[PDB]
């Protein structure tokens, strides 16, 4: 309005205020390369020392799966069961809910079922926690001295850091804590006729701590004048003085002390997990609100102890992402900077007035700040993509300002109107046009919130960003612009030539237009031909979900055959470290190799290797680039190999994996039995490999049967010999498996006690015979007495899906094939199989199929609402249609690019499409808005009004367009870190806009012409 044509500063102040607010935003908000994107998933952990997967499923898990019931938004419930007595159970809860609450919903249940359970486990640990696979980061620690061991490290740590640290979704500690370990000598127990049972018991007794009452505490006596507390034993505090743990005394008189018949050692709480950083032994932490603050408070909690470390105690940040992120963000900001400073001069071109250009110079930043303050009002996680949203906001931000600029400029110079009335005339013209364009453009991005999914939220954030940005841009366009002009604007040979040439060219081209408008059929047909090629492209699409880029690290798994060791594992893992360090040294900065932690649960035949790399400024070799490195290492690890080795990159999202892929999950409905499930499953592998035209990479994520060694016990003779079957089982377990006897103390820290057989006696079938047992009467006896032994094959893995023994199938559809038709193939093959066999999909292969294929609804709805705003501006049923025909034009321009260059589809792509769409609209909008009134209220010739409108306005349509174009260019120009997404974005919008803008100038007129002459 002109409320501000009373008052220059009132709006100056509004604006300074709003920018100040956006500035307030800078600090109080989050920072991340990505927002919260996954649904909230919960996990349960359970432990049973020394047994089978089948064992627990039949003892522990199956219970839980039975007695869970009544839990909100319970999407689904998967469960693993491994043969190290470990269970991880994952329940995903429907999107947009509260972990903090369902965690409890679930823990109450986990506690319904506990007493059903053992005392071993019930006492060991039964934990509830939350899902996070992608480790926020990692830390490693090595002994530079190279003199001590990993358990030393881990013990130090736990005594020092982990608890301070945990006060953060998860902390994981590879290794274990100092726990005392009683390595049992069986031979000498036989000598002295002892089953370990006596050992366990004597230990339970000689290591404890008990009440002592007090002296005269509660009711005293008359004249009593003293009170104190008594104290009994404590927990024995040394291996040495467990050596003193007395059992027995010989009849001769000699006693029986423990130390003489076993190794009393410090060792692992367990260790089926080992680490070596650059090959040198070390230990670690996997660490997981906020990203940067997290990192920095962590570095702080670290520094304190940094000087307090023992000698040869060095840290490492082997697996990290933060600096990557910051660098990406910083340069993506340099982007904005350069894009704006371009405009700074693009004005000077057609204005040449050091203050003809400053209103735009000024406004934009204020608007970006308004967007900051938007997300401030609503939080919404300042982060990368929501920042790209700022990038694309630019030209929208730009247009209306450029517009008013040239409007007033022409009104004054073309005619000689003082600033006030010149401007207010421009306004009497253009007031509502801008409202129109804004309401239009919003019709594109608004409809996306009602679109659901993790992508649902991606679109929510990016689009609401875009749209609020436009809102504020408009508002200011309608506030301060009107006065700035009459605030600094009074009523070359390096550019004079250019103005000359511009004037010549505009006349040449408008003349070509006057010539061609007479011809319509040919160019009319060309429009449709363009549409057809557009559809040809829309069908020739490659397709994806998101890209992945160098992040300073990557990974490689290692799988050995059934039957394995830490040793045959670690030898190979060492060959790997050797390769990476020796042949590709220049980029291989370090390595964090591991032994034990598999990717399909945990085990022995599994290993994982993290790879850390050099700086972005010293890794320019495209040949020795990230993915080519992996490529060539693969061949290196597919040649002289006797074990499977995937070697590859890190998908840069929290466990979403291949989106063109799928993960089928087969289930035994009705008591068919594990064996039949396996049979039909391998059978289906063999049967489905028949169609390598739709279905590719069909491997099971589960693992195969394995030699299980059974020891059958003949109850009869056991009873016959005065024996406790319990004594049998207990000797067995305490020797071979382990046992949580009790606790002891060290440095105010309690710690565990295990009593397990010495190593070299507990490793082989024949070793069994070395074991004896004390019958009732008292005489040591072998297992050979009553023990049968044999072999078979059973699985070490057992998975279940919501109640039921289930198996997994990792697969992918052909690239030019949706995952849906692959689901059709899978159902066709499997549903044809015997009764009792059901199935389901999951994860991606579930999520993306429950809601997919709605984006067309977005675009139809936007189309509609835009038609509406059009007729609103026009009160014309007929006119709107014309301008909508502008949609397709920019489209091809982007589409063709994806083939003109090696680029593909994603979110970014849909987004740039919608963007260029709204932009072409904006362009034609004000063109026609002019021409119409220029006809009606000037009574001009319809065609003549078109020509007048285009002539009076040709320079800015060029200006703003090309300006946004040049602002976007650098990305496509830009390479290096992050350049993946950067270029992916910069490409499509240029491609589309070039076409849209270079072409509308000839057909907007024709569209309107034919609309009017056929109506």
Residue numbers in the entry: 2 to 168, 172 to 292, 297 to 499, 510 to 1033
What does the paper say about this structure?
Here, we report the first structure of the Salmonella AcrB transporter carrying the clinically relevant G288D mutation, solved by cryogenic electron microscopy (cryo-EM). STmAcrBG288D structure was determined by single particle cryo-EM to a global resolution of 4.6 Å. Furthermore, to minimise structural artefacts we decided to pursue the determination of STmAcrB in a native-like membrane environment, by utilizing styrene maleic acid (SMA) copolymer for membrane extraction and direct solubilisation of the protein from bacterial membranes. As expected, based on the high sequence similarity, the overall architecture when processed in C3 symmetry is similar to that of E. coli AcrB and the functional biological unit of the protein is formed by three protomers displaying overall 3-fold symmetry. The overall structure of STmAcrB is closely related to that of the previously reported E. coli orthologue, which is consistent with the high level of sequence conservation between the two transporters. However, analysis of the novel cryo-EM structure reveals that the G288D mutation brings D288 in close contact with the well-resolved sidechain of F610. Hence, while there is no-clear density for D288 side chain, there are also no preferred rotamers that could avoid this close contact, suggesting that D288 is either in a less-favoured conformation or maybe in multiple conformations between protomers, explaining the poor density for this region. However, the residues around D288 show a notable shift, which may accommodate the increased bulk and the major change in the electrostatics of the pocket associated with the increased hydration detected in our previous work. In particular, F610 is positioned further away from position 288 causing an increase in pocket size. Through these changes the lower part of hydrophobic pocket is locally enlarged.
The action of the resistance-nodulation-division (RND) transporter AcrB provides the principal antimicrobial resistance efflux function in Salmonella enterica serovar Typhimurium (from here on, S. Typhimurium). In vivo AcrB forms a complex with the outer membrane factor (OMF) TolC and the periplasmic adaptor protein (PAP) AcrA, forming a functional tripartite complex with a 3:6:3 stoichiometry respectively, that spans both the inner and outer membrane. AcrB is organised as a homotrimer, the functional rotation of which has been proposed as a structural mechanism of the efflux process with each protomer undergoing sequential conformational cycling of states known as access, binding and extrusion (A, B and E respectively), or, alternatively, in parallel to the ATP-synthase cycle—loose, tight, open (L, T, O). The electrochemical potential of the membrane is utilised for transport via a proton-relay located in the transmembrane (TM) portion of the protein, which induces a conformational change that is communicated to the drug binding pockets over > 50 Å via a piston-like action involving TM helix 2.
